[PDB]
Design a protein around this ligand. Structure first.
Ligand SMILES: NC(=O)C1=CN([C@@H]2O[C@H](COP(=O)(O)OP(=O)(O)OC[C@H]3O[C@@H](n4cnc5c(N)ncnc54)[C@H](OP(=O)(O)O)[C@@H]3O)[C@@H](O)[C@H]2O)C=CC1
Ligand SMILES: NC(=O)C1=CN([C@@H]2O[C@H](COP(=O)(O)OP(=O)(O)OC[C@H]3O[C@@H](n4cnc5c(N)ncnc54)[C@H](OP(=O)(O)O)[C@@H]3O)[C@@H](O)[C@H]2O)C=CC1
Ligand SMILES: COc1ccc([C@H](CCC(=O)N(C)O)P(=O)(O)O)cc1
Ligand SMILES: COc1ccc([C@H](CCC(=O)N(C)O)P(=O)(O)O)cc1
Ligand SMILES: [Ca+2]
Ligand SMILES: [Ca+2]
Ligand SMILES: [Mg+2]
Ligand SMILES: [Mg+2]
Lengths: 410, 410
């Protein structure tokens, strides 16, 4: 039986995780949900607790901590360990009754639990790309210290890549290890993208698009932050860096392709030029499930892919003029050092400004661009604790700098 | 050092096999071409011998044996063992200096060298699907006795499927072995097809198609036999049966899909509903190369796949009214026993009759159908030698029956 904790259980990823676990458990009882962890959504967490009855409940915000304890009392025959904040999360991570942890917490914040899960030698089913982008080489260093810990990618393109590999090669290495692409004979990555809601707009239309435009399309079913990143294609930019760190693929060997039907989720070209790709309907349940079953697969009752019904699949290059965030992400990745950290942080700010109607579409890239050119590279700390502080301080520096730039032009 | 013999070196498969070996050897000196074997193309074999300088040369037609020896003595500093007929084939198969054999011999004839290669515990890179279709159960029996032998598929769709699989599971089993699909978590197979030159014809148009139309469908030249089979989609019917035997997949789990761009070469749906596919330009060099390098990959200088330029991929279900050969294959496969043997034999006759303008398009299926209807199940004999002679009897019977049916009408 697979003992699982869901971190960020009330969001888009967490809900999909619980969905697939539920439906798979109807076929055979494969998963035990041992812990749920949310930020503020106490009512929704209670409802999930009622159904799945985990041994652990944690809410990050102390201000709703009491409210959770009282709500949970209605559930008969159930006495969970109810915890909160950083302290609660660390206790769950160190529990010997948990094997696998799904990280569906958003933003740079997802790094903290990812770090402690690793330090506790757990399998980390990581959907949070911000932690990889911002702390790539820290996570690397951490995985060399904690040799039984593993990151399994949940991000759909990276899951697709991972699913295309031979596991007799994968098991010789692990995600975020130097030389991963060489051991797996990977030559090149086709990184597929929906292209987002603005894919058909002219430069003139792009000037005046609003966050509401970005958020209204039902085709995009995710959290608000990632929805905005999909619209600017900064999401794909982040995923380029994520691909580089997870799989040790050279930036010049990662190609972004717009595939509007979202059936082919990404492709791996091996050294012989043979290309392998993973496909399904655009549904996060597959990537989530695979992270929890790897290196095996289990039966599901998901809708089978009907290729003749889909009938047509299309592919084109993205326009860098229309989506300058892509270009900025390659530039930050190629530059290396802490430039990806700076990229992620300034995007956090720019993303949120646009979401709340404070800046325009092209201001997003303008702000990010100015922060990256403000940054002064630092010698990378050889010490693991000092490296973590370095990342925190640089992330924080970049967010402040982005705010300065916004203010300067406001 | 990969010590390889090429059987049927002067045909389409053989030539392509020598092409990729040549090109790959320029990068890394991997392959030793140890043997070349052809029917009667002595001059072409001579030119190949001068380039590749194999330790063995063999020609099936003894009437050109002296012509071979006389041409070969023109090759400066080179003294091969030049061999003859079935005997020469058996000697090459028993050579310890040979590890892998590519079977690029066409038709039921290919089964003989396939059998002897397996009896000598070789790795058999098998392009010849007719041997599998007509003698699948016998090959399975043979592989159970000769435990170090393996069949690695070369047929592009089956190579595709093989590549889509996770080698960590493939390595725990082998092609034709019981439980292959269970071990590999296979739920179903999308068997892709070019659809052939007649894919867009109406029923009335199809009535009138001739062999010259079928053979003009070019790009890369194949044997006349498979070219006609592609036109009737009997090729795909044979491939459905080949899929069943190679991978132990149920007939109701095999779906034929017409993909006219021939970029996706086939797809595997796993029990979780995730789908994996192999893609490249249509080109037999990759499937050939992979059968010789498996479970590894090596570098090539083949043109990289450019998905943006390809731009569109399309899929549709084939019409069984327009292509009744497909239906006949499912029917023969499902009935089991020696019906696949009978299908293959009667097709060999019908195919050749159509090739030579003796019968019409729909007479092909009519003749095959009548032989299948005529045949009565036989008790399957238990020892290998007995089962082989049983196969040979039934094969000869079915060919004679097809010819008699033809003789009765025209
Ligand atoms: N949504 C998707 O399909 C995909 C998401 N991702 C990645 O997954 C991550 C999550 O995205 P998504 O699910 O869309 O985001 P959501 O906004 O939908 O969900 C965020 C979840 O994290 C929780 N959370 C936030 N902060 C904390 C904290 N400090 N402690 C505990 N829980 C916290 C939230 O809790 P609360 O409900 O209380 O606010 C919520 O449950 C992102 O990093 C994203 O990049 C990647 C690919 C696809
Ligand atoms: N062509 C292709 O791309 C594909 C082919 N296949 C399969 O591969 C096999 C070969 O097809 P293809 O290459 O098109 O066929 P070809 O007709 O082009 O080649 C047949 C080859 O086999 C040789 N041959 C015939 N009889 C004998 C024999 N008695 N002993 C030794 N050699 C013999 C021929 O020699 P000679 O030149 O002297 O006549 C020739 O080299 C077929 O079973 C086909 O179904 C499967 C998928 C794709
Ligand atoms: C509707 O299908 C899809 C919509 C959007 C996406 C991408 C954003 C969400 C994501 O990263 N996933 C699912 O991994 P993007 O390609 O627009 O960046 C992928 C699929
Ligand atoms: C142009 O690419 C292609 C042409 C033809 C085919 C098939 C026939 C030859 C074959 O079996 N191969 C290459 O494996 P079919 O689908 O028409 O039966 C596949 C690909
Ligand atoms: Ca594989
Ligand atoms: Ca009868
Ligand atoms: Mg993604
Ligand atoms: Mg084929």
């Amino acid at each position: 039986p697979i003992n699982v904790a869901i971190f960020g259980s009330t969001g888009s990823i967490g809900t999909n995780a619980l969905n697939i676990i539920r439906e798979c458990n109807k076929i055979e009882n494969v998963f035990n949900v041992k812990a749920l962890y949310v930020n503020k959504s106490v009512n929704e967490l209670y409802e999930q607790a009622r159904e799945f009855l985990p041994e652990y409940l944690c809410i990050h915000d102390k201000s709703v901590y009491e409210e959770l304890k009282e709500l949970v009392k209605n559930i008969k025959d159930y006495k969970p360990i109810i915890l909160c904040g950083d302290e609660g999360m660390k206790e769950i991570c160190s529990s010997n009754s948990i094997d696998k942890i799904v990280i569906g917490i958003d933003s740079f914040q997802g790094l903290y639990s990812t770090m402690y899960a690793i330090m506790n030698n757990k399998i980390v089913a990581l959907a949070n790309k911000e932690s990889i982008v911002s702390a790539g080489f820290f996570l690397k260093k951490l995985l060399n210290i904690h040799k039984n810990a593993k990151i399994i990618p949940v991000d759909s393109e990276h899951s697709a890549i991972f699913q295309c590999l031979d596991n007799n090669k994968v098991l010789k290495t692990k995600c975020l290890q130097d030389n991963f692409s060489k051991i797996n004979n990977i030559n090149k990555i086709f990184l597929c993208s929906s292209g987002g809601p603005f894919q058909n707009l002219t430069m003139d239309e792009l000037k005046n698009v609003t966050s509401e435009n970005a958020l209204k399309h039902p085709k995009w079913k995710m959290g608000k932050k990632i929805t905005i990143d999909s619209a600017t294609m900064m999401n794909k930019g982040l995923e380029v860096i994520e691909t580089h760190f997870l799989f040790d693929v050279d930036y010049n060997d990662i190609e972004v392709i717009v595939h509007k039907e979202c059936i082919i989720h990404s492709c791996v070209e091996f050294i012989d030029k043979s290309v392998i790709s993973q496909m399904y309907y655009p549904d996060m349940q597959i990537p989530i499930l695979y992270s929890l079953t790897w290196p095996d697969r289990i039966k599901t009752n998901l809708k089978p892919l009907d290729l003749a019904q889909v009938s047509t699949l299309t592919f084109h290059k993205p326009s860098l003029e229309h989506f300058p965030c892509i270009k900025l992400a390659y530039q930050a990745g190629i530059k290396g050092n802490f430039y990806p950290t700076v990229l992620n942080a300034s995007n956090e700010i720019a993303n949120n400004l646009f979401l709340n109607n404070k800046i325009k579409y092209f201001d997003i890239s303008s702000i990010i661009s100015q922060v990256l050119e403000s940054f002064n590279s630092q010698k990378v700390s050889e010490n693991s604790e000092d490296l973590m502080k370095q990342i925190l301080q640089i992330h924080s520096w970049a967010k402040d700098k982005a705010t300065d730039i916004y203010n300067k032009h406001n």
